[PDB]
Amino acid sequence: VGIRFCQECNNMLYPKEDKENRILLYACRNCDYQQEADNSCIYVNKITHEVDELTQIIADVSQDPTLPRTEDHPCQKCGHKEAVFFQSHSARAEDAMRLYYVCTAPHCGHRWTE
């Protein structure tokens, strides 16, 4: 799914077919470097784009004074009562008004969705 960079000129690698051994290869086009491929996948396109927003949510968001916060929903890691919640905060998110919660208190930085 991702890209891998060349090991000799530090350039971008491209997929190349091995005619003899029938094994997928990544060969840099600006030199002769070749490396074996492990994932065996080249192009991945998620039309629904259902990527979990929890990965895109930054823990320091909990520092925001402008964000609403609730005592009802506790954290799952430390069980801290205080939690800050906000919506998708993103465009092209299909139709989703669901809430994303971030646990406050330092060093926790936990993000969960209900």
Next chain:
Amino acid sequence: TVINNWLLIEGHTIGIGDSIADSKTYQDIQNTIKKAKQDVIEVIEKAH
């Protein structure tokens, strides 16, 4: 002419008294507004 000169007798006006409702009406309006706000809060929570 004739209606203006009769209005000279009866007269017309606007004022504070025309814009003020009964206290029962104010309470009913406030109750309706509170109910509406509660319903909107319920809808927002349901969407959440």
